[PDB]
Write a protein that binds this ligand. Structure first.
Ligand code: GLU
Ligand code: GLU
Ligand code: GLU
Ligand code: GLU
Lengths: 303, 308, 305, 305
């Protein structure tokens, strides 16, 4: 039986004795927080722990709150150098509720971490019998157990009776193929997100610029478009060296280059299919390597 | 043939407009007028107030309205009009996802189908509508789901009202939430709306955006929460102060479908917060701005978020 | 607390298994039949409709426990034939009751919540699955294994359930229950209606077999917008002019089979199914054929119910 | 500029109609057949595969124009039988070419973009619709009328087209094209494979008619996870004991028909289709039956292709 390590971070999730049939499980509590309070320190702790302990185990399961699981998963997807299975899991219903989903979710997460075919696919999220890549995976519904979906490119595999039929793998570079190495970092660059909508205030953008943030992600309208006062603030900030990534509040589809915004004129980067919170993760890691907008665009084209 | 007015606001898609789609002559007598000409990314309160007053004043001059609009904020304008318009004739918004000069431009047929919808007497009394990709969507639930797809507009929580086939609608649904002439919102004498901003939640979220809106004395803040309207700790701290110091706080969600419910992780009664239900952040802003024309009381604003 | 009757049919003492039911209703259960829903049949339908119609004034609402494979068919049949306008809610489970994170317990709880809600009345027969209230006409099984499989794929759900409360935002506009003319109170059998599939190189032999057997009706699971393979079109065009009702439906999982597209139904004596998928179109055609054999009247029925 | 061949088969969809084609490729066309895809058939399939295989070295890529109704079937057939590793892209239109906002022109443009992109080579036969690149195996028509109808409903698209560029992020893992054992170079006919539908009260007459005609194979559009109405099960179990190949697929539009569920396939000699829907399972079963009649070897083929 493979050796699988469970790293607990919190969320609503031996209670699952069927685990004994598929792995030798050992658990460590890393932190114990609601994922709404997830932060850079937890990310840095987790990446360092997995990278340090990679040769001690045959794979990892991280138990985590569902609210920001999609952000942690992408961060680990870029910063983990262990190419053994690394699987995130949570639960949409409390462990004491009727038809609690956590027990099966955990079993399936361990199935995935124990499958040697899971290796080399990047950091995964396993939820509702489905194996999802950490890049595209997002919470689509506030309450449904089936909430996690890879909304642009689809899942990697489906789990039936403890087996995975894998039909896909992510093409974008991940894990040991990225340049991001947080082994010596105790902090990450400051990156904030501003929302666009009718009559949008420029005060949020201005507050982040006044505080000297390293980067700002715009949750734009449509294809990453900006309310004019937000555009003005971010254009000024980019000329003073703030990195600016245009993403979109729209829940599927890319924010493209060569659409309505002249990104080369303003020094802006287009996020592609990365939603605002995922775009933040990649921007904060890009800013550990470069402040140059063309190099940041290349990073957003490859990772 | 019904009289249909086109009110143009901007976006990809009025004798220029009418003449591009001569088939409109088969289904309506079309007239209309350019109200403003802006990209919808720059849509604002002044345009909303102009449009609502124009529709309400002109209601008896026509049998129905089509508003041509940019797609990026169509869903916001639609909900504003759905709450403020007192004309119960068909009011239909329409845009285009591809430029009118592009191969397989969607504008022409979208406009045709919008006039079909505005010309159908069965469209009356269903609130303000969005007609896109052969589908009739209610102004409350309709949202842009995809950055580029022609099929982007969906009613992601409760579904469409009707589908259009060969110029006919089969209506199977109508919105239960009160709209148009059944709301108390009356903007006929307003030149400005209450100031409502939106803040995003994510890992390590800054409190600076929320603090900036409190410092400026905003009437309201809508939170684009994580999951079921949950707040990053530092944003919670700021919004807790806001709600006790004269700024209404609505918890919505960045998550694209499903309700932000009462009786979940946040004790809204203790903080003086309101839960948005299925209204996404930008839609929640629309109703909060209109609620604040009537009341500053959080229990009354919650009642408004449970009825409209 | 409302009185709720659970009518068991099969699929995957319930106050003991789900003790929380005691907090929301007074439940009594009766076993009507015990079958896998892959074996659902006209006789079970007729028994259920008569039982609900007879028992309507003895309870405040019904939950029917049912296999998920044909729940969408039974639900529509009941939606057309039940004359009780008290809540009638069907429920199943996609995971075995002994499996990890079994869905049946909470599904049944939510079904009783829905049947106990006065707001559920007058909405027709419902399906409650995965925290969602779905109308019996549009509701369909979209996925072979997912707990979230049941969706109203054309017009969407009526309401969502959170903490035992429903926020209803929609009701079906099509006539149902006490607003239909269908009355099965005296019937022990239904008109014979079969389904044939269309695909590249499709055999005409299935269609021919049902005509040779004297079926009252045939539903076509057409390609695209209810289109028919040439040899199937030949068989059904003859059948429609020689005493067999023919409904064009679609194997395509969403959208209508429309009037006024490629197939001129008026001229062939065919009926277009609209959004009804083949198995749902069969339900309405069997019930239409209890009233009329006229293609124009059957089309009107497919336009109203 | 690449040389691209358009092979026309019929459906709603010339460098004259879409002059922007001249910017991206040197296009030449040939009419192979001119039929509505509802009438698609084995003879057209054999003609197309042998034409692409014969003509592979004369061009840099192929676009096949086809009706939308059975495009998903032709695409998978070609995906299994084409040995040309150059781009092979199928395309259609959901609106007539003379209608307002006709989608054919841009669809054709994007199909040629895809066929011209060297990164399209080695992905198997593709469908390009609504600015999306779809693999031939998973692609299906999900809506009767929507221009956005074509989706890869289980595993998602391979890439998206923006301003004439493709961002490819996925590729099919199942073996296709020059990696399959199927070779139709010398066939003038395909094994006879029919499809029967399951529903409540299903007739066994369709299944019996196909067995009486000596069909090589029968695909079942099962309920739920490939389940069978009792009388259909009985007919197909009898047929499989006399050598008829039997594939269990599902009428349910997404998800696998799995091994190890309610049906003991090994005991009956049945094959589970996995994610292949009934019409797709027919394609693979017809081609499997050119190699083997053995149920275990047919199952292995359904596990690999
Ligand atoms: N807000 C909680 C929700 C419960 C959970 O998903 O575990 C969290 O994300 O931690
Ligand atoms: N940003 C533009 C896009 C073009 C359009 O949708 O009309 C707008 O929303 O106006
Ligand atoms: N074939 C079974 C599946 C199990 C169940 O859903 O109860 C049925 O539909 O009855
Ligand atoms: N029945 C026609 C529909 C029109 C089209 O898709 O071209 C066909 O599939 O050929």
């Amino acid at each position: 039986l493979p050796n699988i390590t469970i790293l607990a971070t919190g969320g609503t999730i031996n209670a699952v004795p069927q685990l004994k049939d598929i792995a030798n499980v050992k658990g460590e509590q890393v932190v114990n927080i609601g994922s709404q309070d997830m932060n850079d320190n937890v990310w840095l702790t987790l990446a360092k722990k997995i990278n340090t302990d990679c040769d001690k185990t045959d794979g990892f399961v991280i138990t985590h709150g569902t609210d920001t699981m999609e952000e942690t998963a992408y961060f680990l997807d870029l910063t983990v150098k262990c190419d053994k299975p690394v699987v995130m899991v949570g639960a949409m219903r409390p462990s004491t509720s009727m038809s609690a989903d956590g027990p099966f979710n955990l079993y399936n997460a361990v199935v995935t971490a124990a499958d040697k075919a899971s290796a080399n696919r990047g950091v995964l999220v396993v939820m509702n019998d489905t194996v999802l890549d950490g890049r595209d995976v997002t919470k689509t519904n506030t309450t449904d157990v089936a909430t996690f979906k890879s909304v642009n490119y689809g899942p990697l595999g489906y789990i039936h009776n403890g087996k995975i039929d894998y039909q896909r793998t992510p093409a974008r570079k991940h894990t040991s193929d990225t340049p991001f190495d947080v082994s010596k970092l105790n902090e990450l660059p400051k990156v904030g997100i501003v929302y666009n909508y009718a009559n949008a205030s420029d005060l949020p953008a201005k507050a982040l610029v006044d505080a000297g943030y390293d980067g700002i992600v715009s949750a734009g309208v449509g294809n990453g478009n900006l309310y004019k006062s937000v555009f003005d603030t971010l254009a000024t900030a980019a000329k003073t060296g703030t990195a600016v990534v245009r993403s979109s509040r729209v829940p599927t589809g890319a924010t493209t280059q060569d659409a309505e915004v002249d990104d080369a004129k303003y020094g802006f980067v287009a996020s592609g299919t990365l939603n605002p919170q995922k775009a933040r993760v990649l921007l904060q890691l890009a800013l550990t390597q470069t402040k140059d907008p063309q190099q940041i665009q290349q990073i957003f084209n490859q990772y």
